[PDB]
Amino acid sequence: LDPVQKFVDKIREYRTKRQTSGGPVDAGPEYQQDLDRELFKLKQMYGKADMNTFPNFTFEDPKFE
Amino acid sequence: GLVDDFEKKFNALKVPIPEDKYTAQVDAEEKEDVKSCAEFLTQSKTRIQEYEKELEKMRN
């Protein structure tokens, strides 16, 4: 357990974090670094284009064997 | 409005159908008719005629 219940203490700390608006709370320069790193892996996965943009297309001529 | 931008752009983008710049066969055909067709057929007919003429005689 009855004492075990006193969840409360976790919430409060959830609360102060969530109540914070100025990026991700307690930055640390690493965040950007890691971010950028993963932002780079996705470039690898999805391609080197401007994903903000609609794509160009030049199509291949047909091929005969 | 990226999505709106894209849905629009997607539709009413008309993808080109490839030019058929490849039917030179029609030509290579008509050519081999000069060749196969007429020339052979003409000679074959003439040969079949004489053969027939040759069976003519032999009937008598």
Contact A31, A24 (CB under 8 A): yes
Give yes or no for A7 touching B (CB within 8 A): no
Distance CA(B24)–CA(B30), nearest Å, equals: 10
| Residue found by looking up tokens 């930055």 in the block | A27
Residue type, A55: P
Residue A57, both tokens: 């297309």
Q: What is the resolution of the experimental data for this entry, in Å?
A: 37.0
Q: What is the 3-state secondary structure (H, E, C) of A20-40?
A: CCCCCCCCCCHHHHHHHHHHH
Q: Of A52, A59, A64, which is closest to B16 when you measure between CB atoms?
A: A59
The string of DSSP codes covering B2-60 is HHHHHHHHHTT--PPPPP---TTHHHHHHHHIIIIIIIIHHHHHHHHHHHHHHHHHHT-
Distance CA(A22)–CA(A20), nearest Å, equals: 6
Which technique was the structure solved with, according to the deposited record? cryo-EM
In degrees and rounded to multiples of 5, residue B44 shows phi and psi of -55, -45
In degrees and rounded to multiples of 5, residue B52 shows phi and psi of -60, -45
Those residues with Cβ within 8 angstroms of residue A6's Cβ, 6 or more apart along the chain or in another chain: none
Cβ-defined contact of A57 to B15 (cutoff 8 Å): yes
Distance CA(A23)–CA(A32), nearest Å, equals: 11
Distance of CA A57 to the CA centre of its chain: 29
| Residue found by looking up tokens 């004492």 in the block | A3
